[PDB]
Amino acid sequence: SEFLKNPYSFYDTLRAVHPIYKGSFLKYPGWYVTGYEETAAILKDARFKVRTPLPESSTKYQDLSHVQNQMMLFQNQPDHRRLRTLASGAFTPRTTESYQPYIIETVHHLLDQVQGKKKMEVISDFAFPLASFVIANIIGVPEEDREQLKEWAASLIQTIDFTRSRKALTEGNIMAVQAMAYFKELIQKRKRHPQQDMISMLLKGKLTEEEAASTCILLAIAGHETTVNLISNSVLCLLQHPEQLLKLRENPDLIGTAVEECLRYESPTQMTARVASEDIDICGVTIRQGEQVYLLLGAANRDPSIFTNPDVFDITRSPNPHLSFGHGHHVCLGSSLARLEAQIAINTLLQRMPSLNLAEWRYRPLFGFRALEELPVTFE
Amino acid sequence: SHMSTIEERVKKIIGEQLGVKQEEVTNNASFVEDLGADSLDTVELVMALEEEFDTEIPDEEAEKITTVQAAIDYINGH
Ligand code: HEM
Ligand SMILES: *P(=O)(O)OCC(C)(C)[C@H](O)C(=O)NCCC(=O)NCCSC(=O)CCCCCCCCCCCCC
Numbered sequence: 247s248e249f250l251k252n253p254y255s256f257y258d259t260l261r262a263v264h265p266i267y268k269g270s271f272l273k274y275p276g277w278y279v280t281g282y283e284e285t286a287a288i289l290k291d292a293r294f295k296v297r298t299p300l301p302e303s304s305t306k307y308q309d310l311s312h313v314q315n316q317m318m319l320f321q322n323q324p325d326h327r328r329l330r331t332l333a334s335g336a337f338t339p340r341t342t343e344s345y346q347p348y349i350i351e352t353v354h355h356l357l358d359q360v361q362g363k364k365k366m367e368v369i370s371d372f373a374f375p376l377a378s379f380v381i382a383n384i385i386g387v388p389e390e391d392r393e394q395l396k397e398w399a400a401s402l403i404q405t406i407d408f409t410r411s412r413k414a415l416t417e418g419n420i421m422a423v424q425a426m427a428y429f430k431e432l433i434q435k436r437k438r439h440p441q442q443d444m445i446s447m448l449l450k451g452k453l454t455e456e457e458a459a460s461t462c463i464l465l466a467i468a469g470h471e472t473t474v475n476l477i478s479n480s481v482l483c484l485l486q487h488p489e490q491l492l493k494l495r496e497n498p499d500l501i502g503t504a505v506e507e508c509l510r511y512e513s514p515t516q517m518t519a520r521v522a523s524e525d526i527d528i529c530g531v532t533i534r535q536g537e538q539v540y541l542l543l544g545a546a547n548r549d550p551s552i553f554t555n556p557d558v559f560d561i562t563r564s565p566n567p568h569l570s571f572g573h574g575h576h577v578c579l580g581s582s583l584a585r586l587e588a589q590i591a592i593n594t595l596l597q598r599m600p601s602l603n604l605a606e607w608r609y610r611p612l613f614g615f616r617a618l619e620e621l622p623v624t625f626e
Numbered sequence: 627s628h629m630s631t632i633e634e635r636v637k638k639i640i641g642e643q644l645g646v647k648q649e650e651v652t653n654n655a656s657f658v659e660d661l662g663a664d665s666l667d668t669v670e671l672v673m674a675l676e677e678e679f680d681t682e683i684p685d686e687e688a689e690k691i692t693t694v695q696a697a698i699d700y701i702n703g704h
């Protein structure tokens with residue numbers, strides 16, 4: 247709870263000892279990295295491999311493991327490049343720009359439903375519905391099934407986090423069965439009758455039908471969790487700094503640089519991980535083969551050797567080489583989509599709700615993500 | 627019959643977690659070497675013990691324990 251309110255003081259005490267810190271947290275021993283240059287170096291180095299978030303040969307949660315281990319996020323060469331390239335078509339600059347009409351339309355539709363209420367909960371009323379409708383439309387999930395998708399995403403995201411439990415993993419296995427079965431059926435439908443969606447793109451091409459399913463699940467999860475946190479974290483940031491909120495309101499063209507600073511200051515993803523595939527010397531320490539490396543992206547974004555006054559929120563920072571989307575080969579596939587969703591949501595919100603105000607914010611019990619439980623606001 | 631002792635409660639947790647038969651869960655047996663606990667099993671074992679005996683086991687103390695008897699010793703001393 248004390249860590250959730252302000253994790254950056256905890257990151258600072260680690261950084262003061264060493265930017266690569268040998269320790270153990272929540273029963274997980276390894277190297278915890280808070281330094282920017284150390285984080286960037288590790289992510290860029292292919293000798294630090296991604297790995298399965300549960301033990302490779304574990305069959306305690308057989309279905310959960312099988313779904314997890316097929317995802318590009320946890321695959322190395324050469325399987326990673328194959329999987330990523332096949333999914334990349336839906337997330338190119340040009341394709342992402344073509345989503346703008348639907349995003350803008352969805353944003354206005356959601357703001358319409360609360361416009362006369364003088365109150366809203368940013369997450370459940372705005373942030374989540376937008377991100378959910380968008381990703382489901384891209385993948386090709388009909389509106390009738392999008393509530394099931396929300397359930398699977400929320401359950402499966404927990405299964406990779408430090409805070410996971412036996413009951414979370416047991417639940418995750420059930421949701422893995424449901425999600426895999428569902429997408430298998432949807433793929434069979436699209437195989438007979440292709441539509442204008444990502445699933446049909448995957449069938450054009452190679453890629454097994456299970457791999458296509460697990461790809462859909464990965465993208466559904468990322469679309470439902472992180473993007474929602476980006477929007478909600480940003481709104482809170484701006485409202486806590488009225489000086490720059492007013493600045494942004496006066497010129498919406500600053501939304502680009504503003505969203506980048508929100509990404510740096512309250513990073514939706516606080517952690518990713520690697521395993522050392524061999525002995526590696528970095529920053530004066532030796533990481534032995536098989537040892538685990540935990541990269542604290544939020545902490546690296548507060549490195550004073552890169553960002554002069556790191557704990558100051560400043561939307562005018564240029565450039566802003568934050569590590570919120572990671573770095574290297576696994577760098578976020580959907581970063582352009584996330585940025586667009588956030589830019590349109592925040593600008594339109596500030597435009598339509600000119601007197602926006604905050605209504606003791608609690609964060610979800612996740613250590614690898616920075617996610618608000620809710621964000622009530624008042625306006626007009 | 628009798629109420630479950632510290633030893634019996636510990637051994638039951640180990641047996642249920644590792645799917646291993648009792649009396650194969652002997653004292654002096656190693657979790658990793660003998661009972662075949664992997665890098666999740668050992669985490670889930672500590673969680674299950676923490677809940678069973680309503681206690682917090684520091685990461686430092688968990689690292690010291692590698693055998694069944696040692697786990698029983700820790701719970702008796704705390
Ligand atoms: C709907 C929008 C999003 C989609 C579709 C998406 C999708 C993905 C995918 C498929 C990957 C794996 C790429 C690979 O392994 O080659 C990935 C990686 C990653 N994503 Fe995103 N993502 C989205 C939003 C976000 C947001 C908002 C953040 C937080 C700022 C984020 C943070 C990351 C990070 C840090 C990685 C790299 C993880 C690692 O290297 O281990 N993503 N994303
Ligand atoms: P053994 O010696 O067999 O155990 C090794 C393992 C890997 C199990 C570790 O000891 C371990 O259990 N570690 C704790 C769990 C862990 O490392 N989790 C990974 C932390 S985060 C991560 O690796 C990347 C996730 C962040 C990227 C966000 C992308 C958008 C969200 C999508 C989530 C999709 C998940 C289904």
Ligand SMILES: [Cl-]
Binds near residue numbers: 488489
């Ligand atoms: Cl301010």
